[PDB]
Design a binder for this molecule. Sequence first.
Ligand SMILES: CC1(C)Cc2cc(Cl)ccc2C(N[C@@H](Cc2ccccc2)c2nc(=O)o[nH]2)=N1
Ligand SMILES: [Zn+2]
Ligand SMILES: [Zn+2]
Ligand SMILES: [Zn+2]
Length: 393
Amino acid sequence: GSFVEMVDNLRGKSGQGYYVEMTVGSPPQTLNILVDTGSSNFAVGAAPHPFLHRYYQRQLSSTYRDLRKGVYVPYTQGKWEGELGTDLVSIPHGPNVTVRANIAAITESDKFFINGSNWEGILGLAYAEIARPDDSLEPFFDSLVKQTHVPNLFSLQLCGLASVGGSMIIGGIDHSLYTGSLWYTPIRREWYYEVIIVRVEINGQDLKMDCKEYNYDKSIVDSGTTNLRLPKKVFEAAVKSIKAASSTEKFPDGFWLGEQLVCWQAGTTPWNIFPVISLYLMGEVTNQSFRITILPQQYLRPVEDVATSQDDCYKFAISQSSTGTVMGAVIMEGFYVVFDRARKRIGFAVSACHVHDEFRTAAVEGPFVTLDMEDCGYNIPQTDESRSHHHHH
Ligand SMILES: CC1(C)Cc2cc(Cl)ccc2C(N[C@@H](Cc2ccccc2)c2nc(=O)o[nH]2)=N1
Ligand SMILES: [Zn+2]
Ligand SMILES: [Zn+2]
Ligand SMILES: [Zn+2]
């Protein structure tokens, strides 16, 4: 399983993430597993569901061990719950290794498995601190690295209902997947893949906010989120700016809320009137940053319609957040993204699968120098619950 074996090992549907094949148990049961850098549990459907046709059957695995401990995971949008255990786990199109990992067997869920998305489970690739029920449940990637010689790194090339492809290179960086410079921003703290944005520009114009507003209350890289999600004040200033640039076209309010498609005659979409967005990320060097520049074709996402085959129709894929900035697939589909856990940094390069425009290019460019920052990171108010918990590791 050299890096040629791992190229193209991702599939998905637009708007429902990317999954990789994994096997669980002995004899191996093959499942499609969502790649989720925004959570830290490995959890698989483990009972029948109307929208699943396979699921992990613990009773058919000779290597399964029950940990006799439940877990309940709520989301704003639904939930999953299940029974913790361990089993043997392998990635057939990844490194040639097998490991004993924690697995949550999902026994009940609500609004988690969607009609026809094709994944049966989720691979949380973030760190132990945010694992449920607590940080004592070792995430999959920590077990992989500890049990094998796989380097403590992985990279994602997400390529963008329409079918999508990409690659997850486990343990390395595949130079066939990008062009140009790889630029690294630091992992601010190991929980989410948290990073710090220092400046935002919409068509070359600076939003000019206090840069802490960009990271309120965090900014994270999240392959499990579709949109670019922006804190309220940032989202408002962004919408004001894009609306200004595209003011030839008066769209309804529901479009800007992502609740409604806007259309043009097939092949005639005026791409030029929608501006590029540049996010400047903290550099590895003090006072330096680099920018990642997003095309309009990344944040206005085509949705094919029944009554409008005559037309190219689009949904606005930037949305307001109350939980900080989220660089989801909208951002990641431009780029080859390196999750360099060994060196506590995330790299960005232009992807070999480009999502292209007539006259502009998704880009990664630096350096840009200032006088930083003067600290653009936000310090989340410490709860008594947080404060009192002992971490004896
Ligand atoms: C990682 C995962 C599966 C967690 C989740 C749990 C639940 Cl219960 C509902 C939706 C999501 C979700 N929603 C994604 C969309 C999605 C749905 C399914 C697979 C991948 C991504 C999202 N993007 C966004 O801008 O807001 N929510 N992503
Ligand atoms: Zn296969
Ligand atoms: Zn103690
Ligand atoms: Zn702890």
